[PDB]
């Protein structure tokens, strides 16, 4: 298992614009298009992102290309973030995947806001961090996905995904 396979399990793959769990216009592998309510603003962003007139639909390769950029952007965002970088540096390879996952889903800013949990992760207090991470809107909104990520942080194994 690796970060790509993990996020592909968590986000799925859709070749037509869809709305995410929060109601936003998305396409491919969790690629957020816009927070605007307009399908047109969504189609425009999509065409901008792909470099072609898509009429809201893309092929698998296009989906995967966006996905590669997003994972890359995620990792680089973590490494440029003064609050996140130290956490990441401290972690083993599996747990690093868990943090990248959170950042892909909720952006750097959002994760950077989990002050207490980040400190607990840094100190390698697994059980405590797992309990703290569960007291969040995130967990209440996407309980199944949150549980998988959290289990990954607690255990440091890919069990939740097997
Ligand atoms: Cl883009
Ligand atoms: Cl969920």
Q: So where are the chain's domains?
A: 1-162
Residue 151 carries which DSSP code?
A: H
Neighbouring C-beta atoms of residue 5, cutoff 10 Å:
12
43: Cα separation from own chain's centroid: 22
Backbone angles phi, psi at 81, to 5 degrees: -95, 125
Method: X-ray
Give me the sheet containing 31-34, strands edge to edge.
14-19, 25-28, 31-34
| Best CA proximity match to 100, nearest among 128, 70, 61, 120 | 70
Of 20, 47, 64, 128, the catalytic one is: 20
Active site residue 62: no
Secondary structure (3-state) at 50: helix
| Residue 31 to residue 20: CA distance in whole angstroms | 10
Q: Annotated binding residue at 132? A: yes
CA distance to 20, 59, 114, 142, 151, per residue, from 2 (Å): 23, 23, 24, 21, 15
Q: Is 11 a catalytic residue?
A: yes
What value, to the nearest 5°, has the Cα angle with vertex 17 and ends 12 and 22?
70
Rounded Cα gap, residues 16 and 2, in angstroms = 26
Work out the number of other CB atoms within 10 angstroms of the CB of residue 26.
Answer: 21
Apex 101 CA angle, 35 and 60, nearest 5: 70
Residue in 11, 62, 70, 108 annotated catalytic: 11
Q: Tell me how far apart the alpha carbons of residues 54 and 19 are, in angstroms, rounded to a whole number.
A: 17
Ligand with the closest atom to the CA of 31 = 1
CA of 53 to the centre of ligand 2 (A): 32
Q: In this structure, what token pair is assigned to residue 66?
A: 């966006």
CATH of domain 1-162: 1.10.530.40
Within 10 A of 133 (CB to CB), how many other CB atoms are there? 24
The alpha carbon of 39 and the centre of ligand 2 are apart by a number of angstroms equal to 25
Cα distance between residue 54 and residue 147, in whole Å: 36
């Amino acid at each position: 298992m690796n970060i790509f396979e993990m996020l592909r399990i968590d986000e799925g793959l859709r070749l037509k614009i869809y709305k995410d769990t929060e109601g936003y216009y998305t396409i491919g592998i969790g690629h957020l298009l816009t927070k605007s309510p307009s399908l047109n603003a969504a189609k425009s962003e999509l065409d901008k992102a792909i470099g072609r007139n898509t009429n809201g639909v893309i092929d698998k390769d296009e989906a995967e290309k966006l996905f590669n950029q997003d994972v890359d952007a995620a990792v680089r965002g973590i490494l440029r973030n003064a609050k996140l970088k130290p956490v990441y540096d401290s972690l083993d390879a599996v747990r690093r995947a868990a943090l990248i996952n959170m950042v892909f889903q909720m952006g750097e800013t959002g994760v950077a806001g989990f002050t207490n949990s980040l400190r607990m992760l840094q100190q390698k207090r697994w059980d405590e961090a797992a309990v703290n991470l569960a007291k969040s809107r995130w967990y209440n909104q996407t309980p199944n996905r949150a549980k998988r990520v959290i289990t990954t942080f607690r255990t440091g194994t890919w069990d939740a995904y097997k």
